[PDB]
């Protein structure tokens, strides 16, 4: 048993490992989305940049959880990072909707993680989740919601013009 | 025979002269396209600027091949530069599609040139083509492909609005 | 078929997708190694920093291959990123030896990729591999070899002092 | 009763006074450790500096709790600050191990304090503990764990060389 470990339940340790995998998975989804918009037959460079940045952010979220695992004296256990559900993301709007769904899924995982930390009376872990993750998710979800709304109102995905102009004005 | 010449096949020499002509021809095509968009009844100033820059770049590509010819001890032999196939380029989209076709043609000529250089075991010439031309063509072809895609998705050439907005957002 | 595609064999396309997966896998291995040295019972902070940087570099290598795939008009197809072979990397020396083995494996994959590109007479792809990958691998392999040598000569892995001092002088 | 007091249980008030004493006690332990390494027959100047800084930090932690007591309308009640358990700390490693034990003890007191604040439904006090103390303890405990690990691996306390080099490379 680790010399630093204190008030850190084995269940929380495992949950943090699961969250690490989910963060890496989200990174992979955004990476895939990014390069979809880099295709010569899609060619929306700011969608590509937007999702690539989101991908790098998710890798940062994973790293911070790996740091936390070690901080508390838990042991990191990695699993395969699953390929994203889709190869062809269809359109700017569809990618945004998939991103919204991903972020809400990640948020639900974090809320379950927080419930466990609360159940195990781990206020350090509760504070960690709240501080670094919960509002970050709420902000990300609000942003994607805003984006989906604008694309829909502008006439996407039918209007190729709409996705083009959104790429320039919102993501540019 | 030139005091500098070494491992430079007469076939490669002739192929380099042919490539020089093709580069000058591409310069001429882009020059013609440029001023088409400068017409008062077309009036897309950023299309005009975009193609003029492309025209100057092609002249640079020709000059570098003339430099190479002399570097290797070959002798430059120039031919007439043919006028472009078209006087009226129709629309922004059509010009972009013609540019894409030109660049793919130039690329095929360069790949044939590379095949010959390989056949004649001329690694200096192979490296020259690879370094200065091959990725330049791949980048140019990708860019034009991206442009054609956006114009099509935006509704060109029917939508005069589409070509106008593309002129401002992508080429501006 | 892609409007930009030219001289790009389907076999090369698939090989590039396989290489993308391998680059992401290498990123994952280095990420795992990094946090191993961040454990309170290992606690070599410069080993951790060194491998984390290597991990980020591998993600850059993957992204550039995804860019290339689109540049040539191929289509990206992602697969699961396998977890690294090891959870516990044992020691600084052992991690370095595993890194050396990984880089030599990645190098062999790149040489096979180059052989295919040569077989299919794709000089753009040959140049791409040579320019961005081949010397990078040779440099990485030489560096890891140097590191393994120093750690061995210093008395690792038995000498805890040796790994400590190497962490400070070579990786610091 | 204080004009500012609101939702502040008498039990929490007393617990905060106990925590103030513990913070001052920790300050005293680190002060004693510091000057042990300043002895002419120990003479590790960076161990001395490291612990002196830790001592000043603990005094800051005590002051912030005294501030909090007044903020909430509680009344500060001070008790004797007990001398540290040891006069002679034996070695760099032993001092680090004693520091680790102290910080884990202080952490347990803070977790008990948080449990009480939770029991009394005092979210301001919960947030105060989480914000200013809980992660600070986790970080301190991780650091000391790392230090103990390195000293052990380097051969301390038998190796006088090990403590000397650690003093220079880690604490310098
Ligand atoms: Mg998992
Ligand atoms: Mg984000
Ligand atoms: Mg995340
Ligand atoms: Mg599957
Ligand atoms: Mg999806
Ligand atoms: Mg709370
Ligand atoms: Mg909080
Ligand atoms: Mg916050
Ligand atoms: Mg504007
Ligand atoms: Mg000719
Ligand atoms: Mg050009
Ligand atoms: Mg040219
Ligand atoms: Mg004629
Ligand atoms: Mg034409
Ligand atoms: Mg190059
Ligand atoms: Mg507009
Ligand atoms: Mg694969
Ligand atoms: Mg590297
Ligand atoms: Mg690599
Ligand atoms: Mg497996
Ligand atoms: Mg391995
Ligand atoms: Mg090079
Ligand atoms: Mg007391
Ligand atoms: Mg401290
Ligand atoms: Mg304290
Ligand atoms: Mg006493
Ligand atoms: Mg003690
Ligand atoms: Mg905090
Ligand atoms: Mg030194």
XYZ file of C-alpha atoms and ligand atoms in Angstrom:
717
model
C 0.000 0.000 0.000
C 1.213 3.475 -1.034
C 2.906 5.651 1.628
C 0.826 8.633 0.480
C -2.592 6.981 0.306
C -5.193 8.360 2.700
C -9.008 8.301 2.538
C -8.864 7.031 -1.062
C -11.285 4.182 -1.662
C -10.389 1.377 -4.097
C -13.703 2.045 -5.824
C -12.693 5.677 -6.439
C -9.302 4.546 -7.752
C -11.017 2.301 -10.326
C -13.516 5.007 -11.269
C -10.647 7.427 -11.910
C -9.011 4.866 -14.208
C -12.296 4.540 -16.108
C -12.531 8.322 -16.400
C -8.974 8.494 -17.764
C -9.991 6.126 -20.560
C -13.094 8.181 -21.334
C -11.063 11.400 -21.540
C -8.627 9.752 -23.995
C -11.582 8.431 -25.961
C -13.043 11.951 -26.207
C -9.652 13.168 -27.392
C -9.767 10.532 -30.138
C -13.288 11.465 -31.222
C -12.357 15.104 -31.618
C -9.181 14.171 -33.483
C -11.241 12.157 -35.971
C -13.793 14.964 -36.366
C -11.001 17.457 -36.910
C -9.502 15.691 -39.904
C -12.891 14.994 -41.391
C -13.176 18.781 -41.998
C -9.687 18.762 -43.490
C -10.898 16.479 -46.321
C -10.767 18.108 -49.770
C -14.474 17.315 -50.196
C -15.488 18.927 -46.899
C -12.876 21.661 -46.614
C -14.000 23.652 -43.577
C -10.680 24.701 -42.060
C -12.052 26.366 -38.941
C -14.199 23.392 -38.017
C -10.982 21.389 -38.363
C -9.048 23.800 -36.115
C -11.897 23.956 -33.558
C -12.104 20.193 -33.098
C -8.315 19.753 -33.081
C -8.081 22.200 -30.198
C -10.867 20.332 -28.409
C -8.909 17.123 -28.960
C -5.788 18.566 -27.349
C -7.850 19.830 -24.420
C -9.204 16.320 -23.786
C -5.669 14.964 -23.664
C -4.927 17.584 -20.991
C -7.993 16.402 -19.026
C -6.717 12.833 -19.182
C -3.233 13.822 -18.030
C -4.618 15.703 -15.035
C -6.552 12.611 -13.968
C -3.388 10.526 -14.274
C -1.625 13.107 -12.112
C -4.472 12.882 -9.566
C -4.301 9.090 -9.472
C -0.630 9.268 -8.481
C -1.196 12.189 -6.116
C -3.636 10.090 -4.069
C -1.474 6.970 -4.202
C -3.683 5.032 -6.606
C -2.220 3.063 -9.504
C -2.911 3.951 -13.127
C -4.344 1.163 -15.235
C -4.824 1.927 -18.901
C -7.133 0.200 -21.404
C -7.484 0.335 -25.211
C -8.795 3.627 -26.563
C -11.784 2.701 -28.710
C -12.021 4.180 -32.202
C -14.795 6.755 -32.570
C -18.283 5.453 -33.495
C -18.165 7.196 -36.899
C -15.719 7.469 -39.804
C -17.784 9.973 -41.812
C -19.279 12.765 -39.696
C -21.664 13.895 -42.487
C -21.683 17.672 -41.957
C -20.645 20.495 -39.632
C -23.984 20.325 -37.827
C -23.837 16.566 -37.387
C -20.330 16.746 -35.937
C -21.447 19.451 -33.490
C -24.419 17.300 -32.449
C -22.130 14.318 -31.916
C -19.796 16.524 -29.870
C -22.725 17.704 -27.732
C -23.746 14.096 -27.106
C -20.142 13.140 -26.216
C -19.775 15.996 -23.752
C -23.073 15.172 -22.050
C -21.922 11.552 -21.792
C -18.607 12.627 -20.277
C -20.513 14.886 -17.903
C -22.725 12.017 -16.754
C -19.628 9.934 -16.054
C -18.181 12.785 -13.972
C -21.413 13.188 -12.005
C -21.396 9.447 -11.267
C -17.765 9.803 -10.211
C -18.746 12.684 -7.924
C -21.604 10.655 -6.427
C -19.130 7.877 -5.577
C -16.618 10.313 -4.085
C -19.492 11.729 -1.987
C -20.604 8.204 -0.990
C -17.064 7.427 0.138
C -16.745 10.773 1.967
C -13.771 11.912 -0.134
C -13.990 15.704 -0.095
C -10.591 16.162 -1.774
C -11.789 14.158 -4.744
C -15.145 15.936 -4.756
C -13.347 19.290 -4.862
C -11.014 18.055 -7.607
C -13.925 17.032 -9.826
C -15.840 20.249 -9.150
C -12.819 22.517 -9.635
C -11.309 21.020 -12.771
C -14.152 19.215 -14.512
C -17.758 20.050 -13.670
C -17.953 23.683 -14.807
C -15.651 22.895 -17.724
C -18.281 20.415 -18.930
C -21.161 22.827 -18.374
C -19.312 25.464 -20.371
C -18.464 23.005 -23.174
C -22.034 21.748 -23.341
C -23.441 25.286 -23.469
C -21.013 26.223 -26.275
C -21.888 23.200 -28.404
C -25.568 23.816 -27.772
C -25.117 27.391 -28.981
C -23.271 26.142 -32.073
C -25.915 23.548 -32.985
C -28.607 26.196 -32.568
C -26.886 28.666 -34.890
C -26.176 26.061 -37.552
C -29.808 24.907 -37.478
C -31.164 28.450 -37.657
C -28.788 29.279 -40.528
C -30.182 26.375 -42.545
C -27.625 23.592 -42.057
C -26.908 20.934 -43.113
C -28.740 21.476 -46.403
C -27.324 24.994 -46.818
C -23.668 24.551 -47.731
C -23.520 28.339 -47.503
C -24.589 28.182 -43.848
C -21.798 25.873 -42.753
C -19.326 27.944 -44.778
C -20.364 31.234 -43.149
C -20.452 29.703 -39.649
C -16.942 28.368 -40.199
C -15.830 31.945 -40.930
C -17.826 33.997 -38.407
C -18.146 31.756 -35.354
C -15.150 29.436 -35.570
C -12.874 31.968 -37.262
C 30.618 19.170 -73.609
C 30.218 21.295 -70.456
C 33.061 21.246 -67.886
C 30.496 20.863 -65.091
C 28.342 18.114 -66.591
C 28.291 14.848 -64.661
C 25.701 12.043 -64.579
C 23.238 14.222 -66.524
C 21.552 12.310 -69.324
C 20.634 14.082 -72.583
C 17.106 12.759 -72.112
C 16.872 14.491 -68.715
C 18.218 17.716 -70.228
C 15.436 17.681 -72.848
C 12.786 16.807 -70.265
C 13.880 19.774 -68.145
C 13.517 22.059 -71.170
C 9.995 20.711 -71.710
C 9.177 21.316 -68.047
C 10.440 24.906 -68.301
C 7.957 25.522 -71.115
C 5.120 23.979 -69.111
C 5.903 26.162 -66.085
C 5.833 29.300 -68.282
C 2.594 28.086 -69.824
C 1.045 27.690 -66.355
C 2.211 31.207 -65.542
C 0.384 32.433 -68.649
C -2.827 30.590 -67.786
C -2.950 32.124 -64.337
C -2.180 35.565 -65.753
C -5.149 35.250 -68.113
C -7.434 34.006 -65.324
C -6.324 36.865 -63.110
C -7.394 39.613 -65.485
C -10.629 37.866 -66.302
C -11.717 38.633 -62.694
C -10.572 42.221 -63.157
C -13.216 42.725 -65.885
C -15.916 45.259 -64.958
C -18.548 42.586 -65.652
C -16.918 39.992 -63.391
C -15.331 42.229 -60.773
C -14.013 39.776 -58.187
C -10.842 41.507 -57.015
C -9.585 38.761 -54.721
C -9.932 36.076 -57.361
C -7.869 38.419 -59.536
C -5.208 38.853 -56.826
C -5.153 35.101 -56.054
C -4.498 34.057 -59.645
C -1.974 36.854 -60.243
C 0.056 35.602 -57.299
C -0.186 32.061 -58.661
C 1.047 33.387 -62.000
C 4.114 34.970 -60.416
C 4.828 31.756 -58.520
C 4.840 29.772 -61.778
C 7.386 32.164 -63.243
C 9.567 31.457 -60.192
C 9.195 27.702 -60.836
C 10.326 28.204 -64.422
C 13.337 30.280 -63.386
C 14.467 27.636 -60.904
C 14.379 25.004 -63.643
C 16.448 27.270 -65.887
C 18.912 27.655 -63.019
C 19.005 23.850 -62.622
C 19.634 23.319 -66.329
C 22.741 25.511 -66.129
C 23.806 24.052 -62.785
C 24.010 20.575 -64.339
C 25.680 21.806 -67.520
C 22.669 21.337 -69.783
C 21.673 23.965 -72.337
C 18.396 25.866 -72.133
C 16.210 25.665 -75.207
C 13.052 27.734 -75.143
C 9.876 27.286 -77.214
C 6.772 29.442 -77.799
C 4.517 29.821 -74.773
C 1.072 28.759 -75.961
C -1.881 31.015 -75.173
C -4.262 29.549 -72.596
C -7.067 27.276 -73.893
C -9.755 29.790 -72.846
C -10.383 33.523 -73.246
C -13.527 33.619 -71.086
C -13.237 31.592 -67.875
C -17.016 31.720 -67.198
C -17.075 31.969 -63.393
C -14.987 31.739 -60.224
C -15.777 28.037 -59.894
C -14.907 27.276 -63.501
C -11.564 29.053 -63.202
C -10.767 27.090 -60.029
C -11.660 23.834 -61.804
C -9.422 24.764 -64.727
C -6.630 25.596 -62.276
C -7.063 22.210 -60.576
C -6.828 20.467 -63.946
C -3.709 22.492 -64.874
C -1.955 21.669 -61.616
C -2.719 17.960 -61.949
C -1.350 18.097 -65.498
C 1.812 19.830 -64.302
C 2.093 17.243 -61.545
C 1.860 14.383 -64.037
C 4.642 15.963 -66.083
C 6.810 16.201 -62.952
C 6.143 12.569 -62.034
C 7.150 11.524 -65.560
C 10.258 13.672 -65.170
C 11.000 11.941 -61.861
C 10.511 8.504 -63.434
C 13.083 9.407 -66.104
C 15.547 10.760 -63.542
C 15.092 7.478 -61.622
C 15.536 5.445 -64.835
C 18.772 7.299 -65.538
C 19.959 6.919 -61.920
C 20.176 10.683 -61.341
C 19.615 11.094 -57.607
C 20.505 14.807 -57.633
C 17.732 15.453 -60.116
C 15.335 13.194 -58.225
C 16.026 15.158 -55.038
C 15.623 18.466 -56.881
C 12.186 17.492 -58.181
C 11.072 16.121 -54.812
C 12.401 19.081 -52.817
C 11.200 21.969 -54.956
C 8.259 20.622 -56.934
C 6.454 17.485 -55.791
C 5.044 18.629 -52.440
C 4.438 22.093 -53.878
C 2.118 20.463 -56.422
C 0.382 18.307 -53.822
C -0.231 21.390 -51.705
C -1.498 23.412 -54.693
C -3.791 20.606 -55.797
C -5.218 20.179 -52.291
C -5.862 23.942 -52.021
C -7.673 24.141 -55.355
C -9.659 21.045 -54.465
C -10.697 22.717 -51.213
C -11.675 25.872 -53.115
C -13.770 24.028 -55.716
C -15.516 22.140 -52.919
C -16.436 25.303 -51.022
C -17.669 27.108 -54.120
C -19.834 24.120 -55.074
C -21.267 23.765 -51.575
C -21.981 27.512 -51.421
C -24.059 27.265 -54.594
C -21.705 28.458 -57.342
C -21.719 29.247 -60.184
C -25.445 30.017 -60.203
C -25.254 31.913 -56.899
C -23.515 35.195 -57.672
C -23.695 35.764 -53.921
C -21.622 32.622 -53.324
C -18.716 33.685 -55.502
C -18.878 37.168 -53.972
C -18.716 35.874 -50.387
C -15.961 33.357 -51.209
C -13.939 36.158 -52.781
C -14.190 38.031 -49.466
C -13.830 35.249 -46.879
C -11.479 32.724 -48.473
C -9.423 34.768 -50.923
C -9.517 37.966 -48.869
C -12.838 9.045 -56.271
C -11.222 12.190 -54.818
C -10.704 15.185 -57.154
C -7.169 15.607 -55.790
C -6.001 11.994 -55.949
C -3.099 11.321 -58.298
C -0.508 8.514 -58.318
C -1.687 7.365 -54.871
C -2.091 3.604 -54.688
C -4.844 2.068 -52.527
C -2.147 -0.047 -50.892
C -0.257 3.105 -49.848
C -3.479 4.633 -48.510
C -4.027 1.585 -46.271
C -0.391 1.539 -45.160
C -0.662 5.195 -44.134
C -3.743 4.374 -42.051
C -1.792 1.582 -40.347
C 1.083 3.973 -39.666
C -1.318 6.508 -38.130
C -2.447 3.855 -35.651
C 1.145 2.945 -34.805
C 2.050 6.593 -34.165
C -0.935 6.957 -31.791
C 0.069 3.713 -30.114
C 3.605 5.047 -29.561
C 2.080 8.198 -28.099
C 0.136 6.016 -25.659
C 3.196 4.003 -24.642
C 5.155 7.125 -23.819
C 2.200 8.575 -21.922
C 2.062 5.446 -19.759
C 5.831 5.488 -19.183
C 5.671 9.151 -18.251
C 3.224 8.701 -15.396
C 5.001 5.624 -14.148
C 7.898 7.949 -13.154
C 5.401 10.291 -11.516
C 4.466 7.552 -9.002
C 5.392 8.396 -5.397
C 7.366 5.136 -5.227
C 9.380 5.862 -8.376
C 9.555 9.648 -8.250
C 11.905 10.526 -11.105
C 10.432 13.798 -12.349
C 12.724 14.283 -15.332
C 12.109 10.797 -16.665
C 8.424 11.704 -16.388
C 8.925 14.990 -18.275
C 11.125 13.317 -20.928
C 8.578 10.637 -21.795
C 5.640 13.067 -21.687
C 7.373 15.220 -24.279
C 8.036 12.123 -26.382
C 4.345 11.276 -26.087
C 3.297 14.685 -27.392
C 5.769 14.378 -30.260
C 4.205 11.064 -31.325
C 0.788 12.695 -31.430
C 2.284 15.310 -33.772
C 3.643 12.500 -35.989
C 0.181 10.957 -36.156
C -1.465 14.267 -37.037
C 0.986 14.877 -39.874
C 0.145 11.479 -41.352
C -3.560 12.297 -41.126
C -2.822 15.566 -42.918
C -0.898 13.632 -45.600
C -3.744 11.167 -46.090
C -6.112 14.039 -46.888
C -3.508 15.885 -48.952
C -3.239 12.907 -51.320
C -6.988 12.311 -51.421
C -6.965 9.137 -49.341
C -9.528 8.533 -46.606
C -8.575 8.257 -42.944
C -9.687 5.089 -41.212
C -8.972 4.877 -37.511
C -8.732 1.763 -35.314
C -8.566 1.197 -31.535
C -5.348 2.365 -29.901
C -4.045 -0.652 -28.003
C -2.975 -0.181 -24.388
C 0.784 -0.454 -23.874
C 2.218 -3.958 -23.253
C 3.237 -3.041 -19.680
C 1.609 -1.401 -16.655
C 4.750 -1.386 -14.488
C 7.892 -0.324 -16.360
C 10.229 -1.566 -13.576
C 12.988 1.065 -13.701
C 14.409 3.996 -15.663
C 16.680 1.665 -17.625
C 13.890 -0.758 -18.456
C 11.659 2.046 -19.717
C 14.491 3.356 -21.911
C 15.046 -0.148 -23.309
C 11.339 -0.486 -24.052
C 11.406 2.925 -25.743
C 14.380 1.852 -27.874
C 12.516 -1.289 -28.927
C 9.374 0.746 -29.748
C 11.289 3.231 -31.876
C 13.055 0.471 -33.803
C 9.663 -1.152 -34.393
C 8.212 2.133 -35.632
C 11.267 2.561 -37.836
C 10.783 -0.877 -39.384
C 7.171 0.002 -40.161
C 8.318 3.220 -41.859
C 10.935 1.377 -43.917
C 8.261 -1.095 -45.047
C 6.053 1.877 -45.893
C 8.912 3.388 -47.902
C 9.497 0.098 -49.736
C 5.822 0.068 -50.763
C 5.906 3.705 -51.871
C 9.010 2.828 -53.935
C 7.286 -0.282 -55.352
C 4.328 1.855 -56.394
C 6.601 4.573 -57.839
C 5.267 7.273 -55.496
C 8.153 9.718 -55.140
C 6.054 12.301 -53.270
C 5.304 9.749 -50.588
C 8.907 8.548 -50.538
C 10.074 12.131 -49.994
C 7.445 12.673 -47.293
C 8.621 9.638 -45.330
C 12.295 10.535 -45.747
C 11.816 14.214 -44.886
C 9.550 13.942 -41.861
C 10.137 10.471 -40.453
C 13.273 8.536 -41.365
C 15.974 10.764 -39.858
C 13.679 11.571 -36.940
C 13.659 7.849 -36.126
C 17.415 7.486 -36.553
C 17.943 10.412 -34.203
C 15.458 9.040 -31.643
C 17.015 5.589 -31.773
C 20.532 6.986 -31.334
C 19.399 9.079 -28.336
C 17.730 6.150 -26.583
C 20.749 3.988 -27.313
C 22.958 6.634 -25.711
C 20.639 6.779 -22.689
C 20.558 2.999 -22.179
C 24.348 2.919 -22.434
C 24.830 5.604 -19.786
C 22.342 4.046 -17.388
C 24.027 0.648 -17.749
C 27.510 2.080 -17.256
C 26.333 4.053 -14.208
C 25.113 0.844 -12.577
C 21.361 0.831 -13.241
C 18.901 -0.587 -12.444
C 20.410 -1.885 -9.201
C 21.945 1.501 -8.349
C 19.055 3.734 -7.324
C 21.692 6.461 -7.140
C 22.484 5.973 -10.836
C 18.939 6.518 -12.042
C 18.629 9.503 -9.698
C 21.791 11.182 -11.012
C 20.909 10.443 -14.656
C 17.493 11.998 -14.092
C 19.267 15.172 -12.934
C 22.241 15.410 -15.313
C 20.988 13.969 -18.598
C 17.233 14.514 -18.495
C 17.405 17.709 -16.440
C -23.569 36.398 20.279
C -21.617 37.902 17.356
C -23.503 40.191 14.927
C -21.877 38.379 11.993
C -22.435 34.783 13.092
C -24.665 32.714 10.825
C -24.889 28.934 10.327
C -21.704 28.446 12.379
C -22.041 25.623 14.879
C -20.278 25.829 18.263
C -18.768 22.431 17.494
C -17.204 23.810 14.294
C -15.881 26.829 16.202
C -14.100 24.521 18.673
C -12.779 22.289 15.894
C -11.301 25.336 14.154
C -9.541 26.318 17.386
C -8.100 22.800 17.618
C -6.931 23.016 14.007
C -5.230 26.358 14.699
C -3.197 24.692 17.447
C -2.253 21.804 15.162
C -1.085 24.187 12.425
C 1.124 26.053 14.939
C 2.421 22.723 16.193
C 3.365 21.705 12.635
C 5.129 25.042 12.255
C 7.135 24.235 15.389
C 8.069 20.751 14.189
C 9.416 22.081 10.921
C 11.298 24.843 12.729
C 13.019 22.237 14.905
C 13.830 20.035 11.898
C 15.223 23.030 10.053
C 17.835 23.889 12.656
C 18.778 20.274 13.135
C 20.248 20.400 9.583
C 22.019 23.635 10.477
C 24.088 21.785 13.120
C 27.824 21.675 12.346
C 27.689 17.873 12.631
C 24.794 17.511 10.183
C 25.427 20.466 7.893
C 22.865 20.010 5.123
C 21.971 23.606 4.288
C 19.227 22.874 1.774
C 17.413 20.502 4.095
C 17.574 23.363 6.599
C 16.169 25.866 4.074
C 13.463 23.416 2.910
C 12.094 22.790 6.396
C 12.335 26.462 7.402
C 10.162 27.379 4.437
C 7.717 24.633 5.402
C 7.666 26.075 8.916
C 6.756 29.538 7.651
C 4.034 28.052 5.458
C 2.447 26.354 8.484
C 2.342 29.671 10.309
C 0.462 31.083 7.303
C -2.015 28.173 7.525
C -2.600 28.950 11.192
C -3.140 32.652 10.522
C -5.713 31.918 7.826
C -7.674 29.759 10.262
C -7.576 32.564 12.826
C -8.873 34.908 10.132
C -11.660 32.410 9.336
C -12.647 32.105 12.990
C -13.208 35.866 13.166
C -14.844 35.990 9.737
C -17.561 33.588 10.920
C -17.975 35.296 14.287
C -16.332 32.565 16.348
C -13.866 33.376 19.119
C -10.219 32.340 18.969
C -8.992 30.299 21.902
C -5.312 29.450 21.915
C -3.532 26.634 23.780
C 0.143 25.812 24.449
C 2.115 24.770 21.381
C 3.679 21.434 22.292
C 7.384 20.937 21.615
C 8.093 18.491 18.790
C 8.338 14.775 19.709
C 12.057 14.672 18.814
C 15.162 16.736 19.581
C 17.506 14.766 17.302
C 15.991 13.928 13.910
C 18.729 11.366 13.079
C 19.123 11.899 9.323
C 17.656 13.584 6.246
C 15.552 10.513 5.488
C 14.237 10.233 9.029
C 13.216 13.892 9.074
C 11.396 13.458 5.750
C 9.587 10.395 7.125
C 8.576 12.333 10.230
C 7.354 15.175 8.010
C 5.292 12.724 5.941
C 3.721 11.340 9.114
C 2.978 14.876 10.393
C 1.320 15.923 7.150
C -0.839 12.795 7.050
C -1.849 13.497 10.653
C -2.734 17.090 9.793
C -4.667 15.813 6.792
C -6.680 13.420 8.952
C -7.560 16.289 11.279
C -8.746 18.347 8.294
C -10.859 15.476 6.964
C -12.470 15.110 10.401
C -13.055 18.862 10.384
C -14.665 18.563 6.947
C -16.875 15.687 8.121
C -18.125 17.875 10.986
C -18.739 20.850 8.698
C -20.702 18.477 6.420
C -22.619 17.062 9.415
C -23.556 20.589 10.458
C -24.486 21.569 6.879
C -21.898 24.367 6.714
C -21.044 24.642 3.023
C -18.986 27.825 3.486
C -16.714 26.005 5.894
C -16.597 22.931 3.666
C -15.515 25.116 0.741
C -12.937 26.895 2.906
C -11.319 23.614 3.937
C -11.383 22.230 0.394
C -10.078 25.429 -1.212
C -7.264 26.315 1.166
C -6.290 23.062 2.853
C -7.249 19.733 1.301
C -5.296 19.859 -1.969
C -2.447 21.643 -0.200
C -2.131 18.583 2.048
C -2.365 16.132 -0.843
C 0.377 18.029 -2.646
C 2.574 18.184 0.479
C 2.090 14.492 1.173
C 2.929 13.544 -2.420
C 6.098 15.688 -2.317
C 7.343 14.164 0.934
C 6.527 10.707 -0.370
C 8.598 11.451 -3.470
C 11.462 12.706 -1.289
C 11.464 9.655 1.003
C 11.440 7.402 -2.056
C 14.442 9.109 -3.645
C 16.454 9.127 -0.432
C 15.757 5.419 0.098
C 16.652 4.516 -3.480
C 19.852 6.586 -3.266
C 20.968 4.582 -0.235
C 20.073 6.802 2.729
C 20.522 7.030 5.634
C 23.654 4.872 5.566
C 25.038 6.661 2.494
C 26.164 10.080 3.691
C 26.869 10.740 0.018
C 23.198 10.143 -0.815
C 21.854 12.734 1.593
C 24.545 15.167 0.437
C 23.664 14.779 -3.254
C 19.906 14.951 -2.580
C 20.454 18.159 -0.628
C 22.127 19.616 -3.733
C 19.992 18.244 -6.582
C 16.474 18.038 -5.161
C 16.412 20.658 -2.416
C 18.874 23.001 -4.120
Mg -11.632 1.644 -18.900
Mg -13.285 21.641 -24.423
Mg -12.819 16.000 -20.890
Mg -14.630 -1.987 -32.081
Mg -20.538 9.911 -32.154
Mg -19.186 19.887 -1.493
Mg -15.199 23.981 -4.206
Mg -14.595 26.703 -10.495
Mg -16.521 39.478 -42.210
Mg 8.669 22.518 -75.115
Mg 1.085 27.917 -56.502
Mg 4.709 25.148 -61.373
Mg -2.756 27.979 -81.078
Mg -8.048 25.424 -69.165
Mg 10.108 18.940 -48.800
Mg -20.776 37.436 -44.561
Mg -4.464 -0.221 -37.852
Mg 10.834 11.703 -30.311
Mg 6.609 8.549 -34.400
Mg -5.606 -6.275 -25.284
Mg 7.051 -2.385 -24.213
Mg 16.021 15.712 -43.666
Mg -6.036 22.720 21.132
Mg 3.950 22.940 2.874
Mg -0.775 23.133 7.582
Mg 5.534 17.597 27.117
Mg 7.898 13.303 14.770
Mg -8.411 24.107 -5.321
Mg 25.109 19.736 -10.801
